[PDB]
Amino acid sequence: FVKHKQAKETSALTQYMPTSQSLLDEIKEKNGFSWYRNLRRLQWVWQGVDPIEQEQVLARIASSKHSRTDEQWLDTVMGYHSGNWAYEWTRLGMEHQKRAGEMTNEAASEALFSASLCYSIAGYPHLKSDNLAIQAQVLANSAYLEAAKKSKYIIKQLEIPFEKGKITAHLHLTNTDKPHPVVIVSAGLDSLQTDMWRLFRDHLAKHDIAMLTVDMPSVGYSSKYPLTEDYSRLHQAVLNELFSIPYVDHHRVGLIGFRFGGNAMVRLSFLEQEKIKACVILGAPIHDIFASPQKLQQMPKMYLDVLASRLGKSVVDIYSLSGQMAAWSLKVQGFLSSRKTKVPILAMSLEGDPVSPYSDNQMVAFFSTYGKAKKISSKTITQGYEQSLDLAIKWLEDELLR
Numbered sequence: 051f052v053k054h055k056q057a058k059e060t061s062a063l064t065q066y067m068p069t070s071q072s073l074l075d076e077i078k079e080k081n082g083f084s085w086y087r088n089l090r091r092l093q094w095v096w097q098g099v100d101p102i103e104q105e106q107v108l109a110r111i112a113s114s115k116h117s118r119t120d121e122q123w124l125d126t127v128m129g130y131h132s133g134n135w136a137y138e139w140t141r142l143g144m145e146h147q148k149r150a151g152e153m154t155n156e157a158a159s160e161a162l163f164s165a166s167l168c169y170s171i172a173g174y175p176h177l178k179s180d181n182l183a184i185q186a187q188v189l190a191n192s193a194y195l196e197a198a199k200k201s202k203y204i205i206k207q208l209e210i211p212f213e214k215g216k217i218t219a220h221l222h223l224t225n226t227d228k229p230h231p232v233v234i235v236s237a238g239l240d241s242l243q244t245d246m247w248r249l250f251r252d253h254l255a256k257h258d259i260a261m262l263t264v265d266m267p268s269v270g271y272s273s274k275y276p277l278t279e280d281y282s283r284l285h286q287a288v289l290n291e292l293f294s295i296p297y298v299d300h301h302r303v304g305l306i307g308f309r310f311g312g313n314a315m316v317r318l319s320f321l322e323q324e325k326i327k328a329c330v331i332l333g334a335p336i337h338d339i340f341a342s343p344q345k346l347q348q349m350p351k352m353y354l355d356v357l358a359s360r361l362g363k364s365v366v367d368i369y370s371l372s373g374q375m376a377a378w379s380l381k382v383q384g385f386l387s388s389r390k391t392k393v394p395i396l397a398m399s400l401e402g403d404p405v406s407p408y409s410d411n412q413m414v415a416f417f418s419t420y421g422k423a424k425k426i427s428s429k430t431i432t433q434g435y436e437q438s439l440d441l442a443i444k445w446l447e448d449e450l451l452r
């Protein structure tokens with residue numbers, strides 16, 4: 051970080067054509083949002099951030115008197131110091147990493163996992179040219195392995211050759227007493243694979259289900275793998291690799307996919323109908339948004355910035371970008387027309403998720419044998435997350451521990 055005291059601020063990184071800058075101004079004026087980033091308060095708490103410390107972090111960010119790229123956007127304090135998003139979140143990470151040295155075992159481990167998450171959030175949404183975020187992502191990764199090393203649970207980092215690079219994946223096991231059923235898990239384009247420790251700790255592990263995390267192409271450890279129309283590519287290779295991994299029962303493999311991670315799992319559940327025993331997706335952009343250019347052009351700048359990054363765009367034309375993403379729809383690709391899959395897929399999203407409509411999940415569910423879509427209604431978002439996850443583990447319990 052010392053080399054990055056004056057690093058270029060996140061919201062200013064992505065270059066847009068002047069006609070596209072004019073569209074961004076329209077969007078910003080119409081939505082009037084107080085933050086550049088889409089704030090995921092409830093998601094981050096669900097993942098393990100303490101609500102009180104998160105508010106303290108967000109308050110120091112929003113209260114700052116330091117100069118912002120755009121004063122409308124509270125999280126755009128420029129440079130690595132008080133008020134900066136990366137700076138303030140990394141501070142919380144370092145505080146966990148401090149408490150970790152004065153704990154041992156089952157607390158030290160958990161403190162480091164907490165730290166990892168804070169560092170990941172510090173880098174969110176992980177724009178590729180973001181110097182502060184790159185460093186945050188390094189800390190996120192080193193903290194995860196240090197937590198893993200301290201845990202009573204077993205976490206192995208695998209490197210699986212594929213196309214002259216290696217796919218980096220994390221295998222979480224309760225033990226190695228016998229080969230265990232396993233779920234391959236991927237989150238969306240602005241998460242890191244290390245952001246799902248509680249999925250394993252609080253849910254999968256209680257059933258001795260191993261968790262194997264993977265980054266989608268262009269994301270995290272898979273940054274060097276271009277996001278193409280065959281975006282399930284890396285998961286298929288990781289699936290084919292499970293035969294050589296004796297710690298897992300390759301006859302009992304499932305898939306969990308959040309956001310765009312969900313598209314890849316569905317894709318895979320049509321491609322490998324014998325090897326995949328169960329699939330569950332939450333909040334996946336199956337078709338609707340991808341196929342709506344007019345909706346893509348009206349998205350907050352943070353989403354367009356993430357898209358430009360993952361697609362390796364140097365300079366962005368929004369109209370062109372919006373037209374290009376249609377190819378990512380699983381309907382446009384032909385997976386949702388006639389062919390059924392033997393894989394039972396449970397497909398959920400929260401009520402009124404504009405990224406994942408019930409209609410999207412209904413499509414998927416129909417083309418799955420013993421499949422099922424759900425529109426999760428709840429009073430709070432946390433309750434929706436928790437219901438969804440309870441339904442997920444039951445599905446995996448029923449189909450994987452069969």
Ligand SMILES: CCCCCC(=O)O
Nearest residue numbers: 238239240309310311
């Ligand atoms: C805006 C929809 C595209 C991104 C979905 C994701 O976060 O994975």
